[PDB]
């Protein structure tokens, strides 16, 4: 029961998709792939279709293609991008060389919004609430996003929000300091730091920490939150990092009420809990959702967690054809969601 495909060329890329998807219109592109908005005749929905770029180019790409397909097949949550469909024009494993992913079309990203609008407190609460509700789910599957930033948050005209796990200004601006320090044992709360940076930006209209490089970025972080205290200092194994850090002029933690002057004091309070230098002390997603700032949205019986996610594949060292074959299997075993 294979559909009928049709071929077409858009912005240099060749697109071979089933007849059900019509009016392909390019939305954008990048290193990993390109996306077209389209209309899906079978559901009456507007959808986005992503064509992966060179999915089986190297062991790295093949693994990554596998990773993305596995993740997207597992994410089933209102605030996380998931899969309506996945297909390949290939008729067998031998000719398999392209992968297309389909999801609900989301017309904008949070970057398109914060930069072309000033948001009310109510919108900040709704957007951040949704980020946290999706991160709760993601984190419950032992996944760390690691790259939250405005361009990874798809938003529609209804203000509904979904976290994009894989995309296609600077990433470092939203990155937790432990990563600017290269710590190899950072946890899920790296994502909470990013959400804090995002919330700050929606509240003020300005990037909280617009570093020019990795050093400047850490310098701007410490200027707001202060240099590490003795308890945090004790956890740094790297003699170089310690030197670097103990060798800068000491700085105190600023008063967030004075820095975020005029913002709702509940939002300020939450920010303080999110932008803690010590990751062991940052608030978690589930904790943040119960914070009083979200009383008009928080509903503990409607903040689901995820089904277990098997990430053992991540520690495997396989051949391209193996990763390719595993991916083909995932394409074939796909079951779309309900009407
Ligand atoms: Cl940057 C980006 C955006 C999209 C997308 C999703 C929804 N609406 C518009 C754009 C996607 C994407 C991910 C999976 C399937 C299809 C597109 N992948 N990456
Ligand atoms: F300057 C800084 C900035 C951040 C950290 C930090 N926060 N959470 C964890 C760490 C950390 C950094 C490096 N090694 C261990 C732990 C430590 C020092």
Coordinates of C-alpha atoms and ligand atoms in Angstrom, one line a residue:
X1 CA 0.0 0.0 0.0
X2 CA 2.5 2.6 -1.3
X3 CA 1.3 6.1 -2.3
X4 CA 2.0 7.9 -5.6
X5 CA 4.9 10.3 -5.4
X6 CA 5.6 13.3 -7.6
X7 CA 8.8 15.1 -8.3
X8 CA 9.6 18.8 -8.3
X9 CA 12.7 21.2 -7.9
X10 CA 12.6 24.1 -5.4
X11 CA 15.5 26.4 -4.6
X12 CA 18.1 23.9 -6.0
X13 CA 16.7 21.0 -4.0
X14 CA 14.8 18.1 -5.6
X15 CA 11.6 17.2 -3.6
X16 CA 9.9 13.8 -4.1
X17 CA 6.8 13.5 -2.0
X18 CA 3.5 11.7 -2.0
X19 CA 0.5 13.3 -3.9
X20 CA -1.3 14.0 -0.6
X21 CA 1.1 16.9 0.1
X22 CA 0.4 19.8 -2.3
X23 CA 1.6 23.4 -2.9
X24 CA 5.1 23.0 -1.6
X25 CA 6.5 26.4 -0.7
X26 CA 10.0 26.8 0.8
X27 CA 10.2 28.1 4.4
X28 CA 14.0 27.9 4.9
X29 CA 17.1 25.8 4.9
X30 CA 20.3 25.0 6.7
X31 CA 23.1 22.6 7.1
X32 CA 20.8 19.7 8.2
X33 CA 18.0 20.2 5.7
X34 CA 15.3 22.3 4.1
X35 CA 11.7 22.7 5.0
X36 CA 8.6 23.5 2.8
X37 CA 5.2 24.4 4.1
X38 CA 2.5 22.4 2.2
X39 CA -1.1 21.4 2.3
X40 CA -2.0 17.9 3.3
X41 CA -5.1 16.8 1.4
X42 CA -5.6 13.7 3.5
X43 CA -6.2 15.7 6.7
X44 CA -7.0 19.2 5.5
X45 CA -3.9 20.4 7.5
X46 CA -1.2 22.8 6.7
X47 CA 2.1 21.0 7.4
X48 CA 5.8 21.4 7.3
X49 CA 7.9 18.9 5.4
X50 CA 11.6 18.7 6.1
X51 CA 14.0 17.0 3.7
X52 CA 17.1 15.9 5.4
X53 CA 20.3 17.0 3.8
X54 CA 22.8 14.1 2.9
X55 CA 21.4 11.9 5.6
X56 CA 23.9 9.1 5.0
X57 CA 27.0 11.1 4.1
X58 CA 29.1 9.8 7.0
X59 CA 28.8 7.7 10.1
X60 CA 28.1 11.0 12.0
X61 CA 25.3 12.1 9.7
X62 CA 23.8 8.6 9.5
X63 CA 23.7 8.4 13.3
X64 CA 22.3 11.8 13.5
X65 CA 19.5 11.0 11.0
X66 CA 18.7 8.0 13.1
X67 CA 18.8 10.1 16.3
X68 CA 16.4 12.7 14.9
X69 CA 13.9 10.2 13.5
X70 CA 13.9 8.2 16.8
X71 CA 13.4 11.4 18.8
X72 CA 10.6 12.7 16.7
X73 CA 8.8 9.4 16.6
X74 CA 8.9 9.4 20.4
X75 CA 7.8 13.0 21.2
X76 CA 4.0 13.0 21.7
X77 CA 3.1 16.2 23.5
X78 CA 1.4 19.4 22.7
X79 CA 4.4 21.6 23.4
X80 CA 7.0 19.4 21.5
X81 CA 7.3 19.1 17.8
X82 CA 6.3 15.6 16.7
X83 CA 5.6 13.5 13.7
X84 CA 2.5 13.4 11.5
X85 CA 4.3 11.3 8.9
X86 CA 7.8 10.2 7.7
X87 CA 8.5 8.9 4.2
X88 CA 11.0 8.1 1.5
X89 CA 10.5 7.7 -2.2
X90 CA 12.8 4.7 -2.1
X91 CA 11.1 1.3 -2.8
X92 CA 13.8 -0.7 -1.1
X93 CA 16.7 -0.6 1.4
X94 CA 19.2 -0.5 -1.5
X95 CA 17.9 2.7 -3.1
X96 CA 17.1 4.4 0.3
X97 CA 18.9 7.7 0.4
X98 CA 16.4 10.4 1.4
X99 CA 14.2 11.0 4.4
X100 CA 11.3 13.4 4.7
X101 CA 9.7 14.3 8.0
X102 CA 6.2 16.0 8.3
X103 CA 4.7 17.9 11.3
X104 CA 2.0 20.5 11.9
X105 CA 3.0 23.8 10.2
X106 CA 4.1 26.4 12.8
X107 CA 4.3 29.8 11.1
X108 CA 6.8 31.6 13.3
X109 CA 9.5 31.2 15.9
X110 CA 10.0 33.1 19.2
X111 CA 12.8 35.1 17.5
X112 CA 10.4 36.4 14.9
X113 CA 8.2 37.6 17.8
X114 CA 10.4 39.1 20.5
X115 CA 12.2 41.1 17.8
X116 CA 9.0 42.4 16.1
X117 CA 6.8 42.8 19.3
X118 CA 6.9 43.8 23.0
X119 CA 5.2 41.2 25.0
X120 CA 2.7 41.6 27.8
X121 CA 3.2 39.8 31.1
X122 CA 0.4 37.5 30.3
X123 CA 2.0 36.4 27.0
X124 CA 5.3 35.9 28.8
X125 CA 3.6 33.7 31.3
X126 CA 1.8 31.7 28.7
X127 CA 4.9 31.2 26.4
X128 CA 7.3 30.3 29.3
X129 CA 4.6 28.1 30.9
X130 CA 4.5 26.1 27.6
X131 CA 8.2 25.9 27.3
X132 CA 8.5 24.4 30.8
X133 CA 5.6 22.1 30.2
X134 CA 7.3 20.7 27.1
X135 CA 10.7 20.6 28.9
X136 CA 9.1 18.7 31.8
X137 CA 8.1 16.0 29.3
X138 CA 11.4 16.0 27.5
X139 CA 13.4 15.8 30.7
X140 CA 11.2 13.0 32.0
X141 CA 12.5 10.9 29.2
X142 CA 16.1 11.5 30.2
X143 CA 16.7 13.8 27.3
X144 CA 18.5 17.2 27.6
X145 CA 17.7 19.5 24.8
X146 CA 21.1 21.5 25.1
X147 CA 20.2 24.1 22.5
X148 CA 17.2 26.0 23.6
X149 CA 17.1 29.4 22.1
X150 CA 14.3 31.5 20.5
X151 CA 14.7 30.0 17.0
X152 CA 14.1 26.5 18.4
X153 CA 10.7 27.5 19.8
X154 CA 8.0 27.4 17.1
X155 CA 4.9 29.5 17.9
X156 CA 1.7 30.0 16.0
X157 CA -0.8 32.9 15.8
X158 CA -2.8 31.4 18.7
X159 CA 0.4 31.8 20.8
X160 CA 0.6 28.0 21.0
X161 CA 4.3 26.9 21.4
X162 CA 6.3 23.8 20.5
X163 CA 9.9 23.0 21.2
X164 CA 11.9 22.0 18.2
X165 CA 14.5 19.5 19.2
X166 CA 16.4 19.8 15.9
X167 CA 16.5 23.0 13.8
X168 CA 18.3 23.5 10.4
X169 CA 21.2 35.1 16.5
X170 CA 24.1 33.4 18.5
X171 CA 23.5 30.0 20.3
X172 CA 26.1 30.8 23.0
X173 CA 23.9 33.6 24.3
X174 CA 21.4 31.0 25.8
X175 CA 24.1 28.6 26.9
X176 CA 24.6 27.7 30.6
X177 CA 28.0 28.8 32.0
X178 CA 29.0 25.2 33.0
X179 CA 29.1 24.6 29.2
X180 CA 30.9 27.8 28.4
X181 CA 33.3 26.1 30.9
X182 CA 33.3 22.7 29.1
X183 CA 32.2 20.7 32.1
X184 CA 31.5 17.1 30.9
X185 CA 28.9 16.4 33.5
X186 CA 26.3 19.1 33.1
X187 CA 22.7 18.0 33.7
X188 CA 19.2 18.7 32.5
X189 CA 19.2 22.2 34.2
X190 CA 21.4 23.5 31.4
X191 CA 17.9 23.9 29.8
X192 CA 16.5 25.8 32.6
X193 CA 19.3 28.3 32.3
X194 CA 18.4 28.8 28.7
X195 CA 14.7 29.2 29.6
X196 CA 15.8 31.9 32.1
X197 CA 17.7 33.7 29.3
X198 CA 14.7 33.4 27.1
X199 CA 12.2 34.7 29.7
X200 CA 14.6 37.7 30.5
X201 CA 14.6 38.6 26.8
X202 CA 10.8 38.4 26.4
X203 CA 10.5 40.7 29.5
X204 CA 13.0 43.3 28.4
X205 CA 13.2 43.1 24.6
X206 CA 17.0 42.6 24.9
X207 CA 19.3 39.7 24.9
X208 CA 20.4 39.1 28.5
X209 CA 23.9 37.9 27.9
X210 CA 25.0 38.9 24.3
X211 CA 28.5 37.5 24.5
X212 CA 31.0 37.9 21.5
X213 CA 32.8 34.7 22.3
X214 CA 33.0 32.1 25.0
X215 CA 35.1 34.3 27.3
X216 CA 33.0 37.4 27.0
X217 CA 29.9 35.2 27.4
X218 CA 31.1 33.9 30.8
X219 CA 32.2 37.4 31.8
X220 CA 28.7 38.8 31.1
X221 CA 27.1 35.9 33.1
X222 CA 29.2 36.5 36.1
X223 CA 28.6 40.2 36.0
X224 CA 24.9 39.5 36.7
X225 CA 25.0 36.5 39.0
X226 CA 28.4 37.1 40.7
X227 CA 31.5 35.0 40.7
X228 CA 31.2 31.5 42.1
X229 CA 30.9 31.1 45.9
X230 CA 33.0 28.7 47.9
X231 CA 30.5 25.7 47.6
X232 CA 30.4 26.0 43.8
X233 CA 34.1 26.6 43.6
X234 CA 34.7 23.3 45.3
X235 CA 33.0 21.4 42.4
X236 CA 35.3 22.6 39.6
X237 CA 38.0 19.9 38.9
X238 CA 39.7 21.8 36.0
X239 CA 42.8 23.6 37.4
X240 CA 42.7 25.9 34.4
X241 CA 39.0 26.9 34.8
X242 CA 39.6 27.4 38.6
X243 CA 42.6 29.6 37.9
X244 CA 40.7 31.5 35.4
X245 CA 37.7 32.0 37.7
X246 CA 39.6 32.5 41.0
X247 CA 41.9 35.0 39.1
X248 CA 39.2 37.4 37.9
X249 CA 38.1 40.3 40.0
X250 CA 35.5 39.0 42.4
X251 CA 31.9 40.1 41.7
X252 CA 28.8 40.1 43.8
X253 CA 25.4 38.9 42.7
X254 CA 23.2 41.8 41.6
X255 CA 19.7 42.5 42.9
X256 CA 17.4 41.1 40.2
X257 CA 14.5 43.5 41.3
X258 CA 16.9 46.4 40.3
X259 CA 18.1 44.8 37.0
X260 CA 14.6 43.8 35.8
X261 CA 13.0 46.9 37.2
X262 CA 9.2 47.1 36.4
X263 CA 8.8 43.5 35.6
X264 CA 6.3 41.6 37.6
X265 CA 8.0 40.6 40.8
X266 CA 6.8 37.0 40.4
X267 CA 8.7 36.8 37.1
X268 CA 11.8 38.3 38.8
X269 CA 11.6 35.8 41.5
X270 CA 11.4 32.9 39.0
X271 CA 14.3 34.3 37.0
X272 CA 16.4 34.3 40.2
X273 CA 15.6 30.6 40.7
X274 CA 16.5 29.8 37.0
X275 CA 19.7 31.8 36.7
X276 CA 21.6 30.3 39.6
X277 CA 25.2 29.7 38.8
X278 CA 25.3 26.4 40.6
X279 CA 23.3 23.9 38.5
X280 CA 22.6 21.7 41.5
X281 CA 20.6 24.6 42.8
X282 CA 18.6 25.6 39.7
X283 CA 14.9 25.0 39.8
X284 CA 13.7 22.1 37.6
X285 CA 11.0 22.2 35.0
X286 CA 8.4 20.5 37.2
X287 CA 9.3 22.8 40.1
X288 CA 9.0 25.8 37.9
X289 CA 5.6 24.9 36.6
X290 CA 4.3 25.0 40.3
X291 CA 5.8 28.5 40.8
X292 CA 3.2 31.1 41.6
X293 CA 4.0 33.1 38.4
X294 CA 2.0 30.4 36.5
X295 CA -1.1 30.1 38.8
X296 CA -3.4 31.1 36.0
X297 CA -2.0 28.1 33.8
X298 CA -0.6 25.5 36.1
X299 CA -2.6 22.3 36.2
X300 CA -0.7 19.3 37.8
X301 CA -3.1 16.7 36.3
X302 CA -2.3 18.0 32.9
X303 CA 1.5 18.2 32.8
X304 CA 2.3 14.7 31.5
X305 CA 5.6 12.9 31.4
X306 CA 6.9 10.8 28.7
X307 CA 7.0 7.1 28.0
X308 CA 10.5 5.6 28.5
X309 CA 13.0 6.5 25.8
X310 CA 15.6 4.0 24.8
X311 CA 18.8 5.9 24.1
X312 CA 21.2 2.9 24.3
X313 CA 21.8 3.4 20.6
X314 CA 23.8 6.5 21.6
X315 CA 26.7 4.5 23.0
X316 CA 27.0 2.3 19.8
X317 CA 29.7 2.4 17.2
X318 CA 28.1 1.2 14.0
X319 CA 28.7 1.1 10.2
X320 CA 26.9 3.6 8.0
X321 CA 24.9 0.8 6.5
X322 CA 23.8 -0.3 9.9
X323 CA 22.6 3.2 10.9
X324 CA 21.0 3.5 7.5
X325 CA 19.2 0.2 7.9
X326 CA 18.0 1.0 11.4
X327 CA 16.6 4.3 10.0
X328 CA 14.9 2.5 7.2
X329 CA 13.3 0.2 9.7
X330 CA 12.0 3.3 11.7
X331 CA 10.6 4.8 8.5
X332 CA 8.7 1.6 7.8
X333 CA 7.5 0.9 11.3
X334 CA 5.9 4.4 11.6
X335 CA 2.3 4.6 12.7
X336 CA 0.7 8.0 12.2
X337 CA -1.2 9.6 15.1
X338 CA -5.1 9.7 15.1
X339 CA -7.4 11.9 13.0
Ligands
LIG1 CL1 14.2 25.1 12.0 C1 13.0 23.8 11.7 C2 11.7 24.0 11.6 C3 10.8 23.0 11.3 C4 9.3 23.4 11.2 C5 8.4 22.7 12.0 C6 7.1 23.2 12.0 N1 6.7 24.3 11.3 C7 7.6 25.0 10.6 C8 8.9 24.6 10.6 C9 11.3 21.7 11.3 C10 10.6 20.4 11.1 C11 10.8 19.4 11.9 C12 10.3 18.2 11.7 C13 9.4 18.0 10.6 C14 9.2 19.1 9.7 C15 9.8 20.3 10.0 N2 12.6 21.5 11.5 N3 13.5 22.5 11.7
LIG2 F1 32.2 30.3 36.6 C1 31.5 29.3 36.8 C2 30.2 29.2 36.1 C3 29.5 28.0 36.2 C4 29.9 27.0 37.1 C5 29.0 25.8 37.2 N1 27.7 25.9 37.4 N2 27.2 24.6 37.5 C6 28.2 23.7 37.4 C7 29.4 24.4 37.2 C8 30.7 23.7 37.0 C9 31.6 24.2 36.1 C10 32.8 23.5 35.8 N3 33.0 22.3 36.5 C11 32.1 21.8 37.4 C12 30.9 22.5 37.7 C13 31.1 27.1 37.8 C14 31.9 28.2 37.6

